[PDB]
Design an enzyme around this catalytic site. Structure first.
Site, PDB file in Angstrom:
ATOM      1  N   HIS A  40      42.445  85.837  31.955  1.00 11.30           N
ATOM      2  CA  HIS A  40      43.624  85.603  32.153  1.00 11.30           C
ATOM      3  C   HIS A  40      43.990  84.238  30.997  1.00 11.30           C
ATOM      4  O   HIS A  40      45.336  84.094  31.110  1.00 11.30           O
ATOM      5  CB  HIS A  40      44.185  85.262  33.445  1.00 11.30           C
ATOM      6  CG  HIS A  40      43.695  83.779  33.982  1.00 11.30           C
ATOM      7  ND1 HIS A  40      42.909  83.457  34.941  1.00 11.30           N
ATOM      8  CD2 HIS A  40      44.259  82.587  33.808  1.00 11.30           C
ATOM      9  CE1 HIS A  40      42.610  82.226  35.173  1.00 11.30           C
ATOM     10  NE2 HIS A  40      43.537  81.718  34.376  1.00 11.30           N
ATOM     11  N   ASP A  84      37.738  88.551  36.173  1.00  7.17           N
ATOM     12  CA  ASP A  84      38.454  87.367  35.511  1.00  7.17           C
ATOM     13  C   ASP A  84      37.468  86.619  34.391  1.00  7.17           C
ATOM     14  O   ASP A  84      36.998  85.403  34.822  1.00  7.17           O
ATOM     15  CB  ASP A  84      39.241  86.342  36.337  1.00  7.17           C
ATOM     16  CG  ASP A  84      40.260  85.733  35.411  1.00  7.17           C
ATOM     17  OD1 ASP A  84      40.364  85.920  34.126  1.00  7.17           O
ATOM     18  OD2 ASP A  84      40.869  84.850  35.844  1.00  7.17           O
ATOM     19  N   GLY A 175      44.899  73.324  36.924  1.00  6.99           N
ATOM     20  CA  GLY A 175      44.529  71.979  36.522  1.00  6.99           C
ATOM     21  C   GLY A 175      43.180  72.378  36.083  1.00  6.99           C
ATOM     22  O   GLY A 175      42.370  71.817  36.152  1.00  6.99           O
ATOM     23  N   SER A 177      42.853  76.750  34.738  1.00  5.57           N
ATOM     24  CA  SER A 177      42.068  78.173  34.718  1.00  5.57           C
ATOM     25  C   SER A 177      41.009  78.143  33.714  1.00  5.57           C
ATOM     26  O   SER A 177      40.972  77.173  32.662  1.00  5.57           O
ATOM     27  CB  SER A 177      43.357  79.062  34.413  1.00  5.57           C
ATOM     28  OG  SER A 177      44.641  78.771  35.278  1.00  5.57           O
ATOM     29  N   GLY A 178      39.945  78.624  33.945  1.00  7.66           N
ATOM     30  CA  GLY A 178      39.187  78.863  32.842  1.00  7.66           C
ATOM     31  C   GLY A 178      37.647  78.064  32.913  1.00  7.66           C
ATOM     32  O   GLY A 178      36.688  78.094  32.115  1.00  7.66           O
TER      33      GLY A 178
END
Ligand SMILES: [Ca+2]
Length: 223
Positions: A40, A84, A175, A177-178
């Protein structure tokens, strides 16, 4: 990260910021040419920034390298955020030292109540907006599947786990994503989603990277 502490500069060596003009996602360095992040977080024109602490001043240990290729997982569903995960290849190889390092993949899945470390630059407030310029950490446990699926009825698959507190006020989400969730030495997750940030009985939800090691290793060796 809501409710944690300042990591300390260059203490999470495998930590990456993806930058499209501004910090927008985190990621983990897994060898000198490859980064894993969430799907995402796909953007065109990504620059990968390594050895960051303050993403707003050049403090001297950074490397800035353009991405050459991004590979979103074949079955990513952007509605449910199932699967994801995304691979990002670096245009020239990173140079690995004390402050830029790889993190190992899993040979096995972590179990519940294993303590993990979750890092990023994420929003630090649960109501309102405040983003910090320096790296933040939170230590939290992988919650049981039950207590995960109970907070999100019909939303949690085999490819997610929950980590944090049921009680509310420590959480990432926003604070970053990823970004990485590292447990007992090994990358076990990727910050994916979570309703609000640090609500009571709204843990953070994370991509279960243990399910994807075969694909990561095949994809990265063919590209
Ligand atoms: Ca910096």
């Amino acid at each position: 990260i809501v409710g944690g502490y300042t990591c300390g500069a260059n203490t999470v060596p495998y930590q990456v910021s993806l930058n499209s003009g501004y910090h927008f996602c985190g990621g983990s360095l897994i060898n000198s040419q490859w980064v894993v992040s969430a799907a995402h977080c796909y953007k065109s024109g990504i620059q990968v920034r390594l050895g960051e602490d303050n993403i707003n001043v050049v403090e001297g240990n950074e490397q800035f390298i353009s991405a050459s290729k991004s590979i979103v997982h074949p079955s990513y569903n952007s509605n449910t955020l199932n699967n994801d995960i995304m691979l990002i290849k670096l245009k020239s190889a990173a140079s690995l030292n004390s402050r830029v390092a790889s993190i190992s993949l899993p040979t096995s899945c972590a179990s519940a109540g294993t303590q993990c470390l979750i890092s990023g630059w994420g929003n630090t407030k649960s109501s309102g907006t405040s983003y910090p310029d320096v790296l933040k950490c939170l230590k939290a446990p992988i919650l049981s599947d039950s207590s995960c699926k109970s907070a999100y009825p019909g939303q949690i698959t085999s490819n997610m786990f929950c980590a944090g507190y049921l009680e509310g006020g420590k959480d990432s989400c926003q604070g970053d994503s990823g970004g990485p969730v590292v447990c007992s030495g090994k990358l076990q997750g990727i910050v994916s989603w979570g309703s609000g940030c640090a609500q009571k009985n709204k843990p953070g939800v994370y991509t279960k990277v243990c399910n994807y090691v075969s694909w990561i290793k095949q994809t990265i060796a063919s590209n």
